[PDB]
Design a protein around this ligand. Sequence first.
Ligand SMILES: Nc1ncnc2c1ncn2[C@@H]1O[C@H](COP(=O)(O)OP(=O)(O)O)[C@@H](O)[C@H]1O
Lengths: 459, 464, 593, 56, 172
Amino acid sequence: AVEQGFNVKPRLNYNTVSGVNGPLVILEKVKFPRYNEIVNLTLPDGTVRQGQVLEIRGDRAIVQVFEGTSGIDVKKTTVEFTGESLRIPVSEDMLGRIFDGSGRPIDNGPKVFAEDYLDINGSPINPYARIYPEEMISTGVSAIDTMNSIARGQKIPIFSASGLPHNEIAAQICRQAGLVNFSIVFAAMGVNLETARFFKQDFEENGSLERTSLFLNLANDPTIERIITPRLALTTAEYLAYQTERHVLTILTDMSSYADALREVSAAREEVPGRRGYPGYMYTDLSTIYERAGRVEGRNGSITQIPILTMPNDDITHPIPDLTGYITEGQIFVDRQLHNKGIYPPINVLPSLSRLMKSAIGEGMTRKDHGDVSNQLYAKYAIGKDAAAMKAVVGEEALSIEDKLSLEFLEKFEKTFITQGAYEDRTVFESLDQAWSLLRIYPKEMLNRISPKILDEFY
Amino acid sequence: NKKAVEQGFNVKPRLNYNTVSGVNGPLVILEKVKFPRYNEIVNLTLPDGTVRQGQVLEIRGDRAIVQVFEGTSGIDVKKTTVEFTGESLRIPVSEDMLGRIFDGSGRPIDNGPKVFAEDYLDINGSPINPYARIYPEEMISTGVSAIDTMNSIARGQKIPIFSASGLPHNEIAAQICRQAGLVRPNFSIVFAAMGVNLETARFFKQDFEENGSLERTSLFLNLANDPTIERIITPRLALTTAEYLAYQTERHVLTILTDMSSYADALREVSAAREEVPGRRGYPGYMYTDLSTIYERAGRVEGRNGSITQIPILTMPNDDITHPIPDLTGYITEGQIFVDRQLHNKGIYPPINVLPSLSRLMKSAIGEGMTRKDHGDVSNQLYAKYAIGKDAAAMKAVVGEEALSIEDKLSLEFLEKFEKTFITQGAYEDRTVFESLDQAWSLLRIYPKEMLNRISPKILDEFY
Amino acid sequence: YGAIYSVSGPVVIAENMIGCAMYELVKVGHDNLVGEVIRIDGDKATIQVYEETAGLTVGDPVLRTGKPLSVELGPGLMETIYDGIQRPLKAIKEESQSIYIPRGIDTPALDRTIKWQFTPGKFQVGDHISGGDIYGSVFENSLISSHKILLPPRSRGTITWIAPAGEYTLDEKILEVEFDGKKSDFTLYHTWPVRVPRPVTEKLSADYPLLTGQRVLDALFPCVQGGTTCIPGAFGCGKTVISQSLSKYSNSDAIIYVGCGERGNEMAEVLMEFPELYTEMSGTKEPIMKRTTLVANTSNMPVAAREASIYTGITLAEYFRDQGKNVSMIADSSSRWAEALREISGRLGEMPADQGFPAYLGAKLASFYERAGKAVALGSPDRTGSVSIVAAVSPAGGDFSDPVTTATLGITQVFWGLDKKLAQRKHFPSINTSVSYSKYTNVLNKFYDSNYPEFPVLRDRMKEILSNAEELEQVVQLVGKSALSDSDKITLDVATLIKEDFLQQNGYSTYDAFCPIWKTFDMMRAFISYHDEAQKAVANGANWSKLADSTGDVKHAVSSSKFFEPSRGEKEVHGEFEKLLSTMQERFAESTD
Amino acid sequence: EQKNAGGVGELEKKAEAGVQGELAEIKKIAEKKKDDVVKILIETVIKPSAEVHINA
Amino acid sequence: GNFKSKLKKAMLSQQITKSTIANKMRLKVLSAREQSLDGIFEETKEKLSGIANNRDEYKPILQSLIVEALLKLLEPKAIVKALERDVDLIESMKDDIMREYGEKAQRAPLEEIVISNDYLNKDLVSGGVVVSNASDKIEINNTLEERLKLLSEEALPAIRLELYGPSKTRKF
Ligand SMILES: Nc1ncnc2c1ncn2[C@@H]1O[C@H](COP(=O)(O)OP(=O)(O)O)[C@@H](O)[C@H]1O
């Protein structure tokens, strides 16, 4: 059965703060400092701010303070060394609540009655114990479920620039993320109160607030607990999905703001910087965040991770989107140009990719023609973009018959297939039928990427 | 009466430090200093006898990082005596400066006596109280039409001249300097040559004598061969002399700071020696504030009849506005007179390109009694039709004159007779603002009243 | 009291300072220069000084004040200009008898001598009073009358003695709260830390538009009362003029203009122009300046004080929101705040982020822009204030790829991107309609349905026209206008008319200084109707070449509709626009007959 | 909308009625196990362990 | 269409108020557990306050609480802050406490133990000591109140498994 320990461990209070700068507090003469320990800085005003030991020396401990170092006095701040890494108290009753960045509740509810104290950093899942997820989720979005299909257990972000409706797309996916009963955990990371209220309103309207736990860290919230928010949200997701055999859909919005928090912390440590000033280990940090998805051999549960991401200047080469593409399994690319043209969702399926569509596509899973239809659509859309560039450069008359057909397909594809209203939930079969109605523009001879056994059966 | 001068009628001993604890680049690091004062001019005495000035930049306890204006070439640890004056750099100002020629540091080089100081003023100056500022509404009849009617110059205006390497910025800036005069009633002038070659120095020093301005112009000539860091204090010296003159003797000063790009390069070559934050294009991050400290020493103040106009000549590198010097100068200043390489190649003088040119004090000093009521509308209409003509000229160079519409052909004709008969002007030909507006209306009468979409109906009825 | 130990520009590492807190306020130097602590290393606490550090000497005493940077709030805030730190420029000038800002002036933040007509609120003796409750209103001026005196947000307890109605100076006690046996005396003013946002009961969705009065802005990219706004653009684009034409004629009740790193003559222009303009609100022709306060930290004034000016401006705006006023704080040249942060970080030696800026610039900007937003005030009675932030980000070199511009676009809900190319042609306000956006268009449907029902339809229609003609002109610039159809030629001509007579708004002109919402809607209807009827006429078979000559009169009447002075009244201008629409319809009918 | 608004009070009353059983169950569980939990907590708080740091 | 849209907006309003009616009631259940749990800690605090009254039974606990915190400090000299009602006990227990620390830590005995005159607040602290370093810069809040607070923070899952059966959902 369950095992637990009624144990009391007295905690050392250190008034020996050496210096404080940025988010870091340096202590002076800690006794046996413990790495990645959690400390409680008692300010002279009496307020208590949690911390986290980032680096230790013979007697020093460079504590990062989650709630900011404003007001910390080198002569009256007392640091209390708890004796263990940051552990969130989880429970099955945590569903349906709202928590701040540091895991404390926001709603008028009480402190979460603990069911287990899980370390937020988690533990590495044995790759031999991971099940390859081959059960597609029908997100309802045509440009996702038809060309960049998501499998239940896949960590696929939403690469969207600043000011694009990535919040609307993610809310839509959360609303209609059934299979071809998802519990949701949300980690707001410096999103403005408008975006957080929109997400909360959508989750309440769609009935999801009964089975979702939000970890709201607004832009007004301190900028260092953005490093605890993804870990808290993901250890809650791991708890629910694995140790309650539940299905979890984690939404880690503003991973760009998470990486900005890492940059702020790293730059105050004077560490050797990577590209754009981000820490060298930011690949490993983003990996520790993202890689907590996927199903497991024993426990019937899945964390379908959808970390919304704000690529600055709408660039993939930027370190945050680049490393997120390296770690995660494909990405959903939201295009500023398409949004300006007025399409919703403004998903550009050319940079978009889903690494598990190759397995969850079809041939008995969803439909026989799914994979070939998706490949044909992607190829003809690339041809359409090339034809549009050629027409813009050297005139539309010079375009060939194939190029003109590609332009017509591009127009009828952006304006009728990608374009779908919010709260529209076309099934994958309806999406494939619309795709075919697009592909019937071409003659059967110019559909080369379609396998003939499916072309002759669906054309 | 003037009891302030008597308070400074005292003697204060100075400490001579033979304690130079090192030197690296243009920075001399002292030691054992007795209570160092941040930003205190310091007179170094080299082993050879040469005396090099320098100002403290960082005063880490019992240590001073002294940067020397003339360079550290020849500074020895065991021989140089570094003497602390105990006060920031001050120029001895008086009404007798007007008519004298000074070096980069203010030491006269006209074989004349030292300035019989009426007072000593810190060269850095102080930020004029924004409540004490007065918005300059007195427009200057500059004489050049391209400035008088478009991108107009007010009195306290600080409007730089943007020009490429070889463009005649000096000739234009001399024409503005010699013809400027209040439209509805002379300018004392203060000059600061920073890094100009001897040809430009002699051109200005001779044009002033030719026009008779030299009887009321004080020149701060810091040529190319002068020390590079002295160009940092040359514009501060010039503006402190101008601030004295204007805001204390109640004179109207027309400050000219030639080759401001040389000053910006001096800032970069000093910041790169201190390994400071590299801003953009290598210029220091604080170069916005460094140039603002210079430019903002202009404009009229309340209760004082004086006024400092600024015309800081700027040499844009590669003729790029996006460069940090012209970009930050545009942000700080209140206009710009963009001298165009393309126009100069076309042969137009003055080669003023009005499209990038701007003047933020032209929404004032226009209309009613300040100038004719048609000025404000006519300038905008000229800008609109000039831009239309430029766009139609590009379209013509692309597709051919056959595809140009009636409006495009009218725009081409207006652009031709505008560049070749309105921007163009004799070097010594001054045009009153009213005459410039009449020529502008003569140009505008190419279009019918319907096509003039910017002129108000009342102005059209009264003047077209 | 510590001692200075090192000075390097605007940083003063002060030794013998065991006991100073982060962001504490210190009085660095003999002249008592105002400084804030930003880094602590044992005894030495690195201080940034909001005043010219030149002349500081090692060993100059630095006094720890014991309180973070605090702005004094209360009556007398309105109709005054302040420096970065809360210092009145008028009082500084009259105290120094000079035109310069002396180093270390400590004039009181609010004029103590002026006596205000205090009239007590609903609260009586013995009633429990929580933070933010209103216990009296002072008559500030004819426009901001009933400057309701809030209790400090952190203060609570029961009233023991409330002052009767009369005249009181700020130093005079007005109310004494007893809380757990410790009586605390309250006056007309209360200090507040600028860094800490003022608390509110609950923020609200901003559903009412900040009518800028400029056609392009409030007809294509609306801003709501309580929405963050950004105005990127190179020098001369018109950010300052848009900000001034917003603070001159918006529907905001009170305005906190912040010239963080602006030009001095700009603040002088505001000081001389606002008293000469009158706001039709409050039922009288009261001057604008009675509702605007200014935080002037010009470009050459101390670098560190730019941050103080921004935070002071936003704190004043937050206070006037807690009072219940639709404030609209305007942070002129918000990029100068970023440059001040970069300069201070460079002095500190901290590792840079992208392009020299510190790694925390995005976080600071986000926390600053999150202060905006309509919110119910903290205490009784129920009050619904709003702070709208319209900050002019100034890109380095004119490219929007600046880190400050990106970190501002990531947080602001509106983006009024200016175009230098349109600025050069005097096409003003030069709003780049291609890249500019407003995320409040969906929110404003609930207001456009109540008033001007066709406004959103016209807005999307004109955006469609402008986008189509922009693409068509891009094609024509390389492929010639030969292949255009008649409908495409009409689109080109109509969008050129829109850009040159509707989107362009010549400020500093009698007619088009303030084109209000009703005149904007009528002009918008006229332009859209002209386009639609021209396209219908060409579809009916009439050639566009002949129709242009036939309807030049209608086109010029449409283009001249912007000359209808809004001062004639809503009924008069609406009647003139109805007559113009009738004339337009008749002219097209006659031409197509 | 008026019909939906009227049912809010009835819905609130119905929700309150269903919860009241859970509150009774919580009170009963607390009353039953209060002595055991109090004894365990007291015995843990008193009678401390005394062990130096494992690395010392 | 506007009427249909308004009806859709009203329908979603019904779902919004249906959830928040159920959520508020659901958080009423959660607040009931914490309130009753607070009663467990409220009852526990009173019982521990009675331990100090029984000076015979509380006598060796205090020697353990001082030693349990002395071994964590490991400083050669320590300052022991205690209540006004325990200074007399510690004045006699110090000799044995020195030897006990010397034995358990397997090091030289304590150099000097000093009972600071800064007595603890009798209203907030029921027993135990706050042992500090020689310079009073490093201390251990080893009082009974702080000890019970730490136990409350770090034992909640055990109290949950005691008061209630393990949750039926939690498997593996
Ligand atoms: N809406 C407008 N109407 C008229 N003039 C304008 C307008 N916007 C800008 N200007 C012109 O631009 C100049 C000021 O531009 P400004 O807003 O200061 O740009 P920046 O802030 O980049 O310096 C003024 O001379 C003014 O004539």
